[PDB]
Structures are given as structure tokens and as C-alpha cells.
Amino acid sequence: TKPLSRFWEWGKNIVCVGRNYADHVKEMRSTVLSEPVLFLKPSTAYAPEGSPVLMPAYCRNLHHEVELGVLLGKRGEAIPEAAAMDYVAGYALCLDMTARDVQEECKKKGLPWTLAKSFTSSCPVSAFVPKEKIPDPHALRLWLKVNGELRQEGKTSSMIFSIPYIISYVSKIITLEEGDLILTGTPKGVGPIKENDEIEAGIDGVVSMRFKVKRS
Amino acid sequence: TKPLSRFWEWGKNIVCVGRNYADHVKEMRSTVLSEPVLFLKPSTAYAPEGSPVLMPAYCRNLHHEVELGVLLGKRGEAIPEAAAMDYVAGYALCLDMTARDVQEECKKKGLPWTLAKSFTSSCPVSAFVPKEKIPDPHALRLWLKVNGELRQEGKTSSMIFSIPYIISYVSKIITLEEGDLILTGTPKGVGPIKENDEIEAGIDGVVSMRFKVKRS
Ligand SMILES: O=C([O-])C(=O)[O-]
Ligand SMILES: O=C([O-])C(=O)[O-]
Ligand SMILES: [Cl-]
Ligand SMILES: [Cl-]
Ligand SMILES: [Cl-]
Ligand SMILES: [Cl-]
Ligand SMILES: [Cl-]
Ligand SMILES: [K+]
Ligand SMILES: [Mg+2]
Ligand SMILES: [Mg+2]
């Protein structure tokens, strides 16, 4: 069938939320809004552990963004905030790999984030974490090291918009299918990553992952 | 499992190109770029003939965009412009349904086009057109009527970027899977549609389709 433990093989859709961590929003001097920013990645942005991250040709200034992923278990149209967790299969730790220089211009000219945010292997992804293994996803620590050295840490309690709110808020704009994934935003400390850097990230007491960076 | 005739059931990805018709680019007074603008729709934006188009709650000013769809037949990474058509399974006539008021602000504030361009049923789609049935896709007429009355017509010869160029240019930035679909842009004459409008569109001598407009 279509096994959750390898969702990235058959999962159709990826939705990402922007500006879900105050510290990160300051870090960019982009302002927080009444509702969360959404953008998409294609299914071919999945880089499962064992695949490297690939800098695009056009990418001058690649950035790491460690984010918590929410995988969905059921078709979800206008899911009520109070039902959201019924629809969640589990989680995965993700990287919202970003061409920052691209994104800067995409924002200046008022254009789609696709090149900045949506390229092949732009969503490195942990092993699948079933839901029973996380009692409370707002009580987690995310960390990311480059070459053994910590650059990003944050608590999921710091999330401006809750997960259940997001599942609800997204499912009102875009129906969500079995296997669709939502990235829930990144904390303070996003920064550059160059060719043959070695990235480690994890959720304390749940999962860790390693990704090497390559080129074209 | 994977019948091309129902690609919208199992197709994972949708890529759309912006500003591929000079007449439409003028119509907006947005400027042409060296490379085509890309944004995505999720798999749940597919509205196959028989399903209506649905105005979102937030949508104050919905617009029709008739576009030619190119469906892909095999996995496509950095497809050479000279090979592109080897990788094409067939076509579909599509609507790039757009929340224009949203898109206006998305552009002002430099934000993702997702709400403007990526919502549920934002990609109404014809029956599958096999490749045998189209000898030359740059020699086609696209038309769209609202309530019997013609609003959009154009020739696929008017395309700024060729289809083979696009298949190649996209597959350099985002790997494409069997069943992934590319919308190739809209000509002059995009405009509003309101609740319980009746849309007809077609490719002369190839296919037509009917879609009703509903709300929430
Ligand atoms: O903008 C983003 O991608 C974020 O905040 O995670
Ligand atoms: O701007 C668009 O969406 C286009 O040109 O099709
Ligand atoms: Cl960049
Ligand atoms: Cl976008
Ligand atoms: Cl290391
Ligand atoms: Cl609108
Ligand atoms: Cl033509
Ligand atoms: K997709
Ligand atoms: Mg992010
Ligand atoms: Mg369009």
C-alpha cells in the first residue's frame, strides 16, 4: 500500500507556514500578520535521510530552516481547530532549505517564492515519527548543528499559531490529502550553508538526522 | 492505478508559468522577465469536469485564466529542450482560477501567491488529451465563454516561451514526476466571474469543457 514510514515516496503535497516564531520574524525584520504566510513545495522537494541537499545553480546564498513537520492521516477539508489532531498521522523533522538572495528579490519585485523555497531537495526530512511518540508537540526542542556547531534552537511552545489552528487554517484554503505534510516554521538563527557542509538536526528525545550539501 | 485519462486523481504536482502571452502582460502592466514566472498549485486544486469551481470565503474578486496544460509521461530531471516532447504524455485544457484582489496585495507586500493562486479547485481541468491528438501545440486556439459570451481567445503561437523550453527550464529547477502537469499561461481578456456563472472553454477541434461557479 502507501506506508506512513515512507510517506515522502507517495505524499502529493507540502505546505509551509511563514512567521510562526517571533524571534525569527525579528531576525528578518518582516512583520507578523493576523494570519500565517503559506507557500508550497513540490513532492520532489523531499530529500529523505541518505539523499544529500543540492544547491541549485542559481543559488548564491543557501540557508537552513529547521521546522517541525505535521503529516496527515485522512482527507481534510475545513477541519475544525478542535478536531485537527484527529486528522494527524504523525510528524517528521524537516529543513525548509531556502535561496535567501532569490527570496529577497522575489519579495522586492512581488513574485512567487518558488525558486527561493520550492526547488528539488528543498525539503530534507527525518524518519516518520508516529503520533503516540509525541504526547505534546508544543513541548519540543528543535536544534540544528553545522559541522558540529549549533546555529538554531527553539521550543515549539514559541509557536505564534498552534498546530491545530494551522491544520484548520490551511484545510480551509487547501484540502489536505492522506500523506500531505505541513512545515510549521523555523525559530531564530537561520543562516548560510556552503558546499560540503555537514548538517545535523533533531527533536530532543525523539529523532535526529544528518544531511550533506552538494551542487548541480 | 495510474490511468492518464484520470491523471488528476493521482498526479502529485502542478506548475504554472506567468507572463507567457504579451497581450496578457500588457493587460496587467506587469513587465516580462528573461525567464518565466513559476508558482505551484496543490494536487487538491484539480476540479475535474463534473466538479464546480468554488469561490473561497476570502475571495472578493475571482478571475478566469484559460491555459494549455502539458501532462508528463516519465520522471524528468534536467530534461534537454531538444528532448522535452519525448517526456510529454498529453495535454489538458485548464483554468488558472485566481483571487486577483489577494494577488494584488501578495505582490505589494512581497508575499507568496498561494492564497491568490493555490486554493482548492483553483485548477479546473478538461478530459485528458493524448499527444497523438495534438500534432502541434503552438498552432492551437484557446477560447473561454461566460454565460454564452466570449471573454478570452488567443493562439498558442503567441507563447513568449515555447513548451519544450518550459519542460526543460522547469525540470532544471523542480524534478517532474509521471502525472505532473504544467500550465503554460493565459492570453488577453482575463476578468471577473461571480456566483452561479456558467463557464465554457475549449481548444478548437480538440476539446471543450463546462464548469459552474459555487461558494463555500
Ligand atoms: O518564512 C519562513 O519560511 C519561516 O518563517 O519559516
Ligand atoms: O500571470 C499569470 O498567471 C499568467 O500569465 O498566466
Ligand atoms: Cl540564493
Ligand atoms: Cl509562491
Ligand atoms: Cl558533523
Ligand atoms: Cl480576491
Ligand atoms: Cl497558434
Ligand atoms: K504538489
Ligand atoms: Mg520557513
Ligand atoms: Mg496564469
Numbering used by the authors:
A (entry chain A), B (entry chain B): 10 to 225
Please quote the authors directly.
The superfamily of fumarylacetoacetate hydrolase (FAH) proteins describes enzymes that share a conserved catalytic center, yet exhibit multifunctionality in prokaryotes and eukaryotes. FAHD1 was identified as oxaloacetate decarboxylase (ODx), and as such acts as a regulatory enzyme in the TCA cycle; accordingly, as it was associated with the regulation of mitochondrial function.
The N-terminal ‘lid’-structure in hFAHD1 in between G24 and E33 is also present in mFAHD1. Correspondingly, human and mouse protein show similar Michaelis–Menten kinetics, and mFAHD1 displays the same bifunctionality as ODx and ApH. We find that FAHD1 displays bifunctionality as ODx and ApH in both human and mouse with comparable kinetic profiles.
